[PDB]
Write a protein that binds this ligand. Structure first.
Ligand SMILES: Nc1ncnc2c1ncn2[C@@H]1O[C@H](COP(=O)(O)OP(=O)(O)O)[C@@H](O)[C@H]1O
Ligand SMILES: Nc1ncnc2c1ncn2[C@@H]1O[C@H](COP(=O)(O)OP(=O)(O)O)[C@@H](O)[C@H]1O
Ligand SMILES: Nc1ncnc2c1ncn2[C@@H]1O[C@H](COP(=O)(O)OP(=O)(O)O)[C@@H](O)[C@H]1O
Ligand SMILES: Nc1ncnc2c1ncn2[C@@H]1O[C@H](COP(=O)(O)OP(=O)(O)O)[C@@H](O)[C@H]1O
Lengths: 445, 130, 442, 435, 436
């Protein structure tokens, strides 16, 4: 497993009932009984899929749970629906325009669904017999493919033999052949022939011989975003641009062509459109041209639902010289519905700290948890959340199982919050570097 | 150049042009950084970074190969592993116009559609002259 | 069906030779702007004027983009329409002048008609006929090539040039394949394999396609539509050759380049030469740039230069500013953010704000298109909200009311639903009032 | 022989088993609280259970923040990755700063692979291919000074043998697992076939043909990311001349990162790889823009983020990229909530004297007691760094007078010859035209 | 070898010092600045000892006081096979490298690795060459006779020797050098045989010769990186090399020094006009000096309390206080009359100009009055005026003619300041017409 305990990983879905009524504490999130209801309405808006291009705004003070709400919406949305989570500083690119980066972030969050039914013949090659006619225009073949359970013999075509001459196969080679599409792959070499050649080589790989039946039927459902189709249909070999990011300002005419293509697929009926959510954390630091493109780019039919989070008050919009509410211009605020989050009290902070210490496998006493709750009321919540994990290691250094009040006091002594750091800087301002670069290094005057 | 000049039944003419600027490299850097031996791990790390941990390997990443084969339409699932591991000049030199299946996510643009008409078109046609 | 802030507008709504009525085409009010846009539509359909600019201006949420989409709907899908945002002109690959010229050339469409002669069907026989007196030092000297075709209710054998045999051998055409022969150029190509050979082998990776219908020989007149920018980017790139540079550039990132005026001049020359033969037809369209306040003054000067061109289409601008400075200058106070040099070149259309009944009818039609049923009292409360806070805020609070109705298993929208939507979602005014009275480091 | 650069008397944090710190142990004097908190952070890192833990240590200049970070890197060991950084390095002209921050984030998560090296070497005696035209296999006979040994080979290694122009009598090198072939040269037994030839001659290997060795390979996630995202293509093993087109850094798509995480998790689940999270240390964090400070908030919430250590010396200082924001240590208030602040205290006279004595010890110099008192008074009067920088010219001036011990006179000449910042500023103030 | 017309610092052959590091009044082209020369000698001994690393010194003083003269003296006193990088403050502002990457490359170009290797060589004079072909020409046989002044021998040639001698055609009487292990043969010249011209070699024909190589860390950094080859050392497009190859080069160099196959030779990086760097470059410089492979940095600046670049405050020497905290400062002083006249006499000796005593005294007076560089520029331009009247020695009239023809700073400012209507001002206002 390649996942550690993150900042908010206890949140698994929105804690709602069938009637979109939030529980006081369920599946991770505590309190916030109106933002959870509004986010449930937004989740049902996404899951209906009948409307498009609407932006909501999550505004509140810092350390309130806006990104926790976004994580809950992402976890309760489930799979197969795309969820793009970007920050405000990602769109300022050296090789890409701001507007095209916004367009790529818009088109990475809406995809289509393709259903593929396969007929796989996976087995070990034993012998290949090649027969030619008198004219020699076409070549016939015999394939002896073998599983652990059974073995049979198929036939080849001219294109099959030509495609098997490319990527050379011998006896003991594990291949798989699709009946309907004719797809060819070389899985590697069997372990039964791993002791004959005495040296492997560069292109070889050893896989186990498969078991069971030969012709297995299985259907696959693929979810392809529109940005992937845009990248693929813009170059000769475009998947490397998908995995390296050097797409470089894809032209609009292929985007209109792909939009007409997707409409044709939906009308004919081999695909259906899965909308998604684009989440922009810290939207306040975006340039005014990006805001204008966001304003005018939400009226397209192939537009997802945008979630923005801002913890700023009436501040200065970037790129301009005035001040606006939430750091956003009034044209975008007209095209929005605002979800407001409110600060917590002692019991909610108590429950959140209990949940976070429960996940981190830290056992707290009642008095230590009360001290952490008092610190979370006085200082911020994240200070207490980090103090839990530090005090657990302090408890292990004392050879103790559960933490005590003394470990929390030692963690409070050894580590500082913002206010104590500000005070200790202010009473010793001569030893730190000022705005004018003035400092004193010598301690004796 | 500093070539082989004459200080004066056939005569041999062999290309022998060199550059007057000589860059001298000690043997130790070559034998201990570029050539594999018993005490270095050039080949081991090369295999480890190019074969075992490659994301286009069908022995470990068959789902991505099938997804990309649906996306592009390549008839072979080892095409991406072969493309990602050979240099660009080698790729453009031996590129072959193999067929692609129609049931895929990619078809032809308008510009290429106009392009394939005028490959061997004669003059006096409107689309060829345009 | 997906609806996104639009698609309840179909055209403008004028009658013939007369005044636009109040209830037509999804438009409520804005009668004078609709008449002006109808006159603009007639001017575009006259196909005579070039390089005309129209700036339509008003407050936010008035119907500027709705009128532009009504222009595009009234002209039809054959007339090109290029929607442009003012932020799109700034690129990190080319200069903004070249981006403006590319979007300028994208708005001119060309209609080309052509007659094609074809020979398609399943291959019956393939016999390179030898000559009567073969030449020494060679083998299989072809005198002519006999190829037999088979289609639906049609069978025809053909005599071919001996040079077609190289194209047969190149594209690997065998018996049973279906081919596609161009008349004048030759140049056969393999469409695929016939469906009658689909069960020939057990495992075979081969494209199988149906046998084509109709006769083997037919004359079809094909009308094709391209724009001038497609012709520019197709003539600019080098054609299919064997050099390393062309395929290496095909295998790399397609970076844009500053296309010179010489190529555009030659494209216009050959295009005019093929109009005067009666073959091609030129269709101008609309280049619509909205929020032109974000344009720099260099782009305004290049617009001043580019509007005097002969091939230029009609350009429509939209802005919602008052007395603001032009970007790139620190003292030019100008109306609508447009410098006075460009303002003299264009006609200004004014759009007016709405009333109680117009907002009520707009909300009613938007709820009709969104497939929702609303009551009378809920509609009156929504109209009161629309004239109290914003029209767009009342328009965006319809679908969550439908969700809250569906949660309580009702297909009707009533007063407590919009009250719960008020209590859940805030507009900008109450958000600003919350911001101004909070001192919690917000 | 031995080199010394501002450090290397720092060997560790110097703590006992209880976590408390001694006064003078491990090259550290003073600052008990910061060293104990750093040991707690070391234990938290060794737990290998938390991700995205940000630590700020703050104090005046020449107090020992970089010495503490180096003590962290020494206490964790060479197995744990450590990526030191300065805040100015995030600005590049090839890619955006956020992508450089993501690369520096993924450089601190390491892996350990256990691999076996198998090598055949020796003089070729038999090279007889045969066809199944296509060759089915080749059989190679190798000879060394301890015997001979024959091997069957696959045709790909026969092609690689034909690449090096291997004939009978050439000493070659074959790796069994990778398949690389290196031609060492012709053997000495065939050195007298001609009196003059363009072929170098090497003796026979004195050991066996077969050699077996177990090795450990340490790679990070950034190495796999840059190995899987070559835009030009896969490189050859030997390319002394450069590529025809210059490869430039690109914006790596997060889908590639997801696939790399999937492959690494699959290899971890089979017991082949071991995950070693490490430390990303950023010095002079106040040189960062507010955009990188915003992207750090997103980057600290990942499930694979390493432990981040920041160090700063500024006070109530304006953050870069802003005009009306005053924040402590040059760190914005949206980000300063997420860390824990470790305070670092200035030094006294006796601590400065002990530091100077330790630096004279590690530099292999002998000083007198009165010279030590004068250097301590100079360090308390001008700066601690001035005496440490003036220690070595004192040793050179003592060496030029044929003495092995620094006395007061050499300190006086070093004070006269080289100035500090205060005397240079007092010369700058009382001068006519630009000093 | 090292073509040069006349340099402005061409008379400085090194630091004039005794065996006790004492500066003579006149030695090696350097006069005056006794304490600065003693400090630079101490820094030279610090470089030559090589046991300490990453120390930055600063040379600050008034303009035209010999700071660059001190740097050139240290560079000449180091001699060969020791790296010395001299860059300016404006060089790092690249469009295709970052500033930290350019500073890193300049840091690693100043430290080198000394590797000793031995290669067996054959060099002599060709007497006679036979090339033999068979009936079909499939097999080539040959004999080569080569001699020195002490021996003569005949070699039986193989096929690849025959192809290597047919290519780059070697005739009789030709002196060549043959490398057996690489196959490269070079023609040294032609022997002195009338019957270029190089003498016949002496001693044994087959010599094992030892060549000592010095390679910087930046070269191994470039070669170890697989993105670009060694041709980027000459073309100059390295392009932001990653830190991983730097760490591998660090570990490899450390284990080479531990095994004993190679030694580390540190050098000096000289930064000239260091005051024009950004504060990001200064902050990188603070943390780049504690690495084990870090050279000794020399900075020269002449500013006073001026604005640091990229900031909005003023600092001493144009540098922040944390950078000045890790620096020891050598201060240079202005000159006297005797030192000015000795500098002018040395510049007269280097410019092959014969001067009279009165001309030298007039040059000394006008150098004390205005500038040392003004007199050092006038002394070379007076010789052409002297040669126009066809006499060798430069007299007083030539110096007065040169003083009349070519102005200095103060006279030009004085002439401008009452004629400012004829010059373009800060507002772009100028008067062109003579009247009105
Ligand atoms: N409703 C909630 N339930 C549980 N934890 C919460 C909640 N709201 C906030 N938190 C905790 O607060 C921490 C940081 O809050 P965050 O969501 O970042 O606030 P904001 O989004 O306003 O910055 C997270 O680690 C999360 O665990
Ligand atoms: N006259 C009208 N009739 C119907 N709907 C209108 C009218 N005017 C505006 N609207 C609606 O108002 C919404 C926002 O209008 P918009 O085009 O954004 O105006 P503006 O361009 O002035 O901001 C659109 O979804 C549109 O459907
Ligand atoms: N407690 C200590 N014991 C020994 N040496 C110290 C101590 N604190 C600092 N130093 C030395 O002081 C020098 C400068 O300290 P430094 O780490 O640069 O502080 P800062 O990073 O805050 O400027 C370092 O070389 C370090 O070896
Ligand atoms: N002590 C000295 N000995 C010899 N030449 C000197 C001395 N001091 C200055 N000069 C000469 O003065 C000239 C200009 O001085 P320069 O070093 O360029 O000034 P700065 O130190 O301001 O760069 C140089 O040609 C230099 O040779």
């Amino acid at each position: 497993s390649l996942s550690l305990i993150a900042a908010h990983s206890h949140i698994t879905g929105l804690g709602l009932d069938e009637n979109l009524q939030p529980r006081p504490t369920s599946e991770g999130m505590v309190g916030q009984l109106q933002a959870r209801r509004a986010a449930g309405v937004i989740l049902k808006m996404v899951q209906n899929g009948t409307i498009a291009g609407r932006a909501v705004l999550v505004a509140g003070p810092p350390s309130t749970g806006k990104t926790a709400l976004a994580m809950g919406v992402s976890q309760s949305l489930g799979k197969d629906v795309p969820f793009t989570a970007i920050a405000g500083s990602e769109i300022f690119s050296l090789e890409l325009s701001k507007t095209e980066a916004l367009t790529q972030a818009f088109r990475k969050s809406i995809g289509i669904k393709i259903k593929e039914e396969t007929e796989l013949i996976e087995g070990e090659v034993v012998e290949i017999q090649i027969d030619r006619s008198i004219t020699g225009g076409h070549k016939q073949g015999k394939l002896t493919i073998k599983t652990t359970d059974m073995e049979t013999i198929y036939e080849l075509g001219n294109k099959m033999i030509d495609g098997l001459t490319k990527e050379k196969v011998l006896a003991g080679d594990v291949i798989s052949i699709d009946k309907a599409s004719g797809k060819i792959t070389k899985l590697g070499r069997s372990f039964a022939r791993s002791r004959d050649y005495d040296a492997m080589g560069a292109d070889t790989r050893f896989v186990q011989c498969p078991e069971g039946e030969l012709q297995k039927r299985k259907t696959v459902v693929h979810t392809v975003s529109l940005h992937e189709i845009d990248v693929i249909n813009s170059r000769t070999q475009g998947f490397l641009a998908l995995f390296t990011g050097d797409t470089g300002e894809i032209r609009s005419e292929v985007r209109d062509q792909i939009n007409t293509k997707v409409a044709e697929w939906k009308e004919e009926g081999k695909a259906e459109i899965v909308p998604g959510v684009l989440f922009i954390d810290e939207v306040h630091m975006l340039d005014i041209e990006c805001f204008s493109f966001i304003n005018r780019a939400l009226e397209d039919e192939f537009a997802p639902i945008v979630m923005m989070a801002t913890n700023r008050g009436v501040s200065k919009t970037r790129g301009t010289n005035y001040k606006s509410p939430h750091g956003l211009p009034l044209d975008l605020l007209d095209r929005s519905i605002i979800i407001t989050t409110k600060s917590y009290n002692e019991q909610e902070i108590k429950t959140i700290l209990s949940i976070r210490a429960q996940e981190e496998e830290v056992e707290l006493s009642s008095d230590a948890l009360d001290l952490l709750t008092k610190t979370g009321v006085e200082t911020s919540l994240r200070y207490s959340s980090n103090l839990i994990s530090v005090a657990q290691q302090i408890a292990m250094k004392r050879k103790n199982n559960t933490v005590e009040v003394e470990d929390v006091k030692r963690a409070y002594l050894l580590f500082l919050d913002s206010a104590r750091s500000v005070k200790y800087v202010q009473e010793n301002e001569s030893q730190y570097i000022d705005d004018q670069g003035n400092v004193q290094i010598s301690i004796a005057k | 150049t500093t070539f082989g000049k004459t200080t004066s039944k056939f005569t041999d003419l062999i290309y022998s042009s060199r550059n007057p600027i000589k860059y001298s490299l000690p043997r130790l850097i070559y034998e201990d950084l570029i050539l594999p031996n018993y005490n270095n791990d050039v080949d081991i790390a090369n295999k480890l970074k190019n074969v075992k941990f490659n994301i286009f390997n069908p022995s470990t990443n068959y789902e991505l190969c099938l997804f990309l084969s649906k996306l592009t339409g390549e008839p072979s699932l080892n095409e991406f592993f072969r493309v990602s591991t050979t240099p660009l000049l080698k790729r453009v030199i031996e590129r072959t116009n193999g067929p692609k299946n129609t049931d895929s996510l990619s078809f032809k643009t308008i510009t290429q559609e106009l392009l394939e008409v005028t490959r061997n078109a004669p003059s006096e046609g409107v689309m060829a002259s345009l | 069906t997906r609806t996104a802030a639009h698609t309840h507008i179909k055209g403008l709504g004028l009658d013939e030779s007369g005044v636009a009525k109040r209830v037509e085409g999804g438009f409520v009010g804005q009668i004078e702007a609709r008449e002006a846009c109808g006159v603009i539509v007639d001017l575009i359909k006259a196909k005579k004027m070039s390089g005309r600019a129209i700036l339509l201006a008003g407050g936010p949420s008035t119907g500027k983009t709705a009128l532009a989409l009504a222009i595009s709907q009234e002209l039809g899908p054959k007339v090109p329409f290029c929607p442009l945002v003012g932020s799109e002109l700034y690129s990190v690959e080319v200069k903004k002048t070249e981006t403006l010229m590319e979007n300028f050339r994208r708005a001119i469409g060309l209609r080309i008609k052509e007659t094609k002669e074809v020979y398609e069907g399943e291959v019956t026989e393939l016999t390179p006929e030898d000559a009567e007196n073969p030449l020494g030092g060679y083998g299989k000297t072809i005198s002519h090539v006999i190829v037999g075709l088979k289609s639906a209710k049609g069978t025809k054998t053909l005599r071919l040039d001996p040079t077609i045999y190289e194209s047969i051998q190149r594209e690997k055409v065998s018996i049973g394949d279906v081919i596609y022969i161009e008349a004048n150029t030759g140049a056969v190509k393999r469409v695929g394999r016939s469906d009658a050979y689909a069960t020939e082998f057990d495992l075979e990776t081969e494209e199988y396609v149906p046998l084509p219908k109709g006769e083997v020989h037919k004359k079809k007149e094909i009308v094709q539509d391209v724009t001038l920018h497609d012709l520019d980017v197709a003539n600019a790139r080098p054609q299919g050759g064997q050099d390393v540079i062309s395929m290496m550039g095909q295998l790399l990132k397609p970076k844009k380049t500053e296309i010179t005026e010489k190529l555009r001049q030659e494209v216009n020359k050959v295009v005019a030469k093929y109009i005067d033969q009666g073959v091609a037809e030129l269709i101008p369209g609309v280049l619509f740039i909205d929020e032109v306040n974000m344009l720099d003054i260099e782009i305004f000067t290049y617009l001043n230069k580019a509007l005097e061109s002969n091939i230029a289409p009609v350009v429509v601008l939209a802005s919602n500013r008052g007395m603001t400075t032009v970007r790139g200058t620190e003292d030019v106070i100008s109306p609508h953010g447009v410098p006075p040099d460009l303002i003299d070149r264009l006609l200004i259309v004014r759009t007016l704000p709405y009333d109680k009944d117009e907002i009520r009818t707009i909300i009613e039609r938007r709820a009709t298109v969104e497939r929702l049923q609303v009551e009378s009292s809920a509609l009156d409360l929504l109209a009161t909200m629309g004239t109290e806070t914003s029209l767009r805020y009342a328009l965006q609070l319809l679908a969550p009311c439908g969700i809250l109705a569906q949660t309580s298993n009702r297909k009707e929208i009533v007063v407590n639903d919009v009250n719960e939507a008020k209590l859940l979602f805030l507009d900008a005014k109450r958000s600003t009032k919350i911001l101004e009275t909070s001192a919690n480091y917000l």
